Design a binder for this molecule. Sequence first.
Ligand SMILES: Nc1ncnc2c1ncn2[C@@H]1O[C@H](COP(=O)(O)OP(=O)(O)OP(=O)(O)O)[C@@H](O)[C@H]1O
Ligand SMILES: Nc1ncnc2c1ncn2[C@@H]1O[C@H](COP(=O)(O)OP(=O)(O)OP(=O)(O)O)[C@@H](O)[C@H]1O
Ligand SMILES: O=C(O)CCC(=O)C(=O)O
Ligand SMILES: O=C(O)CCC(=O)C(=O)O
Ligand SMILES: [Mg+2]
Lengths: 447, 447, 224
Amino acid sequence: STVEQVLEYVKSNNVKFMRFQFVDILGVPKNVAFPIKAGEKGIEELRDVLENGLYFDGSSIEGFVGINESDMMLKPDLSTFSVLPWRPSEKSVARVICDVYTTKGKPFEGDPRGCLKRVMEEFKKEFNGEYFVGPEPEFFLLKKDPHNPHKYIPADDGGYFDLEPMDEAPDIRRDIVFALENLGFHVEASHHEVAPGQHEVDFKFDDALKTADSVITFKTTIKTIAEQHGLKATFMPKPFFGMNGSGMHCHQSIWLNGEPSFYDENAPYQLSETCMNYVAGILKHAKAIVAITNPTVNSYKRLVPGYEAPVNIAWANSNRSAIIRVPAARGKGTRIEFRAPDPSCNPYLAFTVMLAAGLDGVKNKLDAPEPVERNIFAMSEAEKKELGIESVPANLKAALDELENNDVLKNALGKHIFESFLEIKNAEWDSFRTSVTDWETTAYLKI
Amino acid sequence: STVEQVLEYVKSNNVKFMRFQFVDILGVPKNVAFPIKAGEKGIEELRDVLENGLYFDGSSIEGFVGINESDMMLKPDLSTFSVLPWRPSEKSVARVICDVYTTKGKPFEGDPRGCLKRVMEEFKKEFNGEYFVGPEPEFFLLKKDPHNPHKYIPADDGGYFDLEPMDEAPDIRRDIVFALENLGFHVEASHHEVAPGQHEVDFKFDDALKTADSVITFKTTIKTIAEQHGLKATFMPKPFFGMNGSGMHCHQSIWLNGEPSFYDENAPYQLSETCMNYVAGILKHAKAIVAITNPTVNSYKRLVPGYEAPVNIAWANSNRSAIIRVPAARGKGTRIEFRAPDPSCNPYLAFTVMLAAGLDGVKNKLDAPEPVERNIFAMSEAEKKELGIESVPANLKAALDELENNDVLKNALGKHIFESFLEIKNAEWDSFRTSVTDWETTAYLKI
Amino acid sequence: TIAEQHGLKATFMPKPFFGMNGSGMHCHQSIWLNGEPSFYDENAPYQLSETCMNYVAGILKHAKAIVAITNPTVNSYKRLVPGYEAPVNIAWANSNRSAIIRVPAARGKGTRIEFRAPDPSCNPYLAFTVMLAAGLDGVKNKLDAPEPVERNIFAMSEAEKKELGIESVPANLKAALDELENNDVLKNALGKHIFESFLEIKNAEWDSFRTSVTDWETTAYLKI
Ligand SMILES: Nc1ncnc2c1ncn2[C@@H]1O[C@H](COP(=O)(O)OP(=O)(O)OP(=O)(O)O)[C@@H](O)[C@H]1O
Ligand SMILES: Nc1ncnc2c1ncn2[C@@H]1O[C@H](COP(=O)(O)OP(=O)(O)OP(=O)(O)O)[C@@H](O)[C@H]1O
Ligand SMILES: O=C(O)CCC(=O)C(=O)O
Ligand SMILES: O=C(O)CCC(=O)C(=O)O
Ligand SMILES: [Mg+2]
């Protein structure tokens, strides 16, 4: 939208506050609220901030700048304008997502959003291509343990596609869908997921930048709506041992010159050569991609080699036992599902590395291996070794070491994001590996 | 006629009470309520009190007069007229900020407000200058510890620029902004600050006297609105060990003959000679300025030499590790940020000493040192010693001893305020230094 | 250990409770040369020898630095607190408990000086070292002791003490460490290793105290 359209909506819908939003290196949303004054004076002041942006302290944001070079700017992207449904209707609250700039008026090298914009701009200039993503960020709804109020348990005992009363969340999922529609999402479906208290609310795919903006907005919405219902929502990959973790499978496709390039009516599986080259790129860099798409210690309690998880580096058709599933849908619906990611990732960075890795396959015309039509979880380790089916790294540190040795992902992320992420995550790993866990006390106090 | 405008507002908006307000030497607001009677008789009784003022006992106000010379007067400044938003709408409550006078009709020498008026009047008479200040008084929102209802803890676990639900204060910050707008403030921005439960609500800079009035009104507004939400707000500089303290950074600039004299398009850093002379004055008197801008024992738990704090007596551009930061903004936005102050200061006295010190630099054309573009917190003590970077005093008593030996600040404050402040603060220091603290019981009971 | 056996806890903390006396460790001391009580002199004023006066003069000269060692905690300066009734006034007196040194009435082999500033948080080996090295600085150089103060020093005004030359010991641990750091007699007595380790340990202890947020501050300032 244009500055005029934004001011006009604010003017006629009594918007009182404008959130200027962005994300830190870990994908945590950040914002400052600008109060809109009454009259022409207020609209002119808003026009100035919307066009010229505002300053903030970059040294108080994770992965940004140091204290001695800390002044930074936010430049609003006006096409991201939305009204917050959870906030009041009278004297309402709108938001605008921003790109981080330096004081010199240049895009910040450490901005995750600008990082995704730049790889998308390069993809459009080099191939006239568009990168489309449909992510499915699952979550748990939690309530306090009646036996210990300091602990959280799943909000119900339901399972996949269950009906009420076993599924206790229709009212919560209902309000979430209404909120996402008011924020401009095209919601597709909602249902109880496999684990107790786990849920899914699907929204239509879009270009990687809009989709990344929606993943950030989506997580805030589920969390604030769950609070309104006296519950707590979590996007933690594996909150509970013994039940499913939450993934964020990323359905993705590239469209060259406005066409669904992954579809080929006369090819095997009706999948194009470009689709196979892209799949080959993702499988080649899968071990390093997971440092970014699965960036927490807990991510590897769901993405756990040796078990039933999206860890096996192979692709397959309508088969949920490989790291890539190719859904049965064809035509414009032809796409690949990268199953490894979880909702703890920074979507801007996750989409950057998946595109960079897939385009490494397209640019070099890499050969994809044969699909694996068997249940990979039913194969023995030696049978997978013979077939060449490798696994992703088994923990955060092993994934960071893969990322550190991947030139394609280092170039896509750029020096600043790449080195800050490795530094932050190495300190996070050090904190975990030096702690004394409850598992250890249970296992070893008796010795 | 300003009085005619006040009386007409009262007549037509059903105003029932008029608070006559002022501050004691420590900046604590004080007021007496006058009930407005109906009709022309009531309006003339109110006219008489607005014009002629009213009496009070100055011996019951800290830093004022003794019991044997205790009758004093309050002379309303009618440009301060405002309606209290927290008070009822029907039969509303208005306020007027007053200047303290003696029974002989003379401005009281011990009045902090008159003290700032007088230095500003002298600055306008001598240079045709205006003194503009933009302060940022941070605060914590507190709730009772569920484990001990006698103790207070931060109201949430959020951090800098966090969004809800982690940031739990959008409703409180919203009501604060509305209350400040109703009080005539030009609010600029609001957001969660670095520490858990900490927040910031910025308002536009103005002349030092209006800004000092606004700081007093701002702190009452924050505190009353927080109480309405079942929380407690504190402007204590360092309420909790291990997390950020609350500062009140003072952005300031002097405008000679209506122009932003700190801006110089053709000078290094685009900062004028006057700006450099002013910075040199603040740096010269910084050790004594902090007795007034950081006047509590607790102020030196945030302003603590040897740690990451605004203690290093140096200036820098877009660098938050020095006692003065010069923001990147230029033109009319050209200003210096004195980072040492905290919201426990009396803004009338704080603005007086900062202007007096800056003008000592302007009047004598003092040379400012070179800016320090490095992170001062990364330098060793010997490296700072070589560069001539000194630190502010380490505690209240050390700061009082600096103030006692500063003729520029003693003359700006005047004998009465200066001697009363030193006497009160020496008794406050004596109280602290003779107490047995919890730190000591933990450290030494075992010996 | 005996208090624990009675179900109680004993503490040698200098000032555990505000509003009541602290615990001191007054050190009565005397030097005997060639087996004789050299502090006693039957025919001298107060029956105190010249050696006794030289020793008292040495302790009073170094009192400001001695307290870094004899009063080595933050809490020591809540008992040893200048401006109040405490053994802070650098003067000596006979049978008078308002000075830093009291000379008890006993004479003969009982002739000695009572250094009242120390508290039981000190390392006695280091406390006795600095007191002896300061007293012997007075003996070796035959320093002149000031006149005794027979008045109640707590009843004097600050200006009256300033005129009489009655100074106070440092007001806190850090001020005492800074006095010790500038005293060559005590640095030589302790030696480089003990001296530098003590200053390093105590500066970290001071930093810990000065960065903490105390209960006094919460009570005083949470309401602002
Ligand atoms: N051509 C495409 N490119 C990228 N994403 C697409 C495309 N077509 C659909 N999607 C997106 O794929 C996501 C998953 O859709 P959908 O749930 O219908 O498939 P699915 O096989 O049922 O996956 P799952 O079983 O994991 O839920 C949706 O966000 C959808 O918008
Ligand atoms: N020329 C000026 N003179 C004095 N004050 C000014 C001037 N221009 C702006 N200010 C004030 O300075 C204050 C700082 O506002 P602002 O937050 O925009 O700057 P900032 O450098 O980002 O501060 P911070 O990052 O510490 O919050 C505001 O109160 C503003 O009104
Ligand atoms: O339950 C859902 O998933 C969506 C909402 C709904 O169907 C309902 O309101 O019953
Ligand atoms: O949250 C703030 O800082 C101001 C209030 C606001 O933005 C809101 O109502 O959501
Ligand atoms: Mg689905």
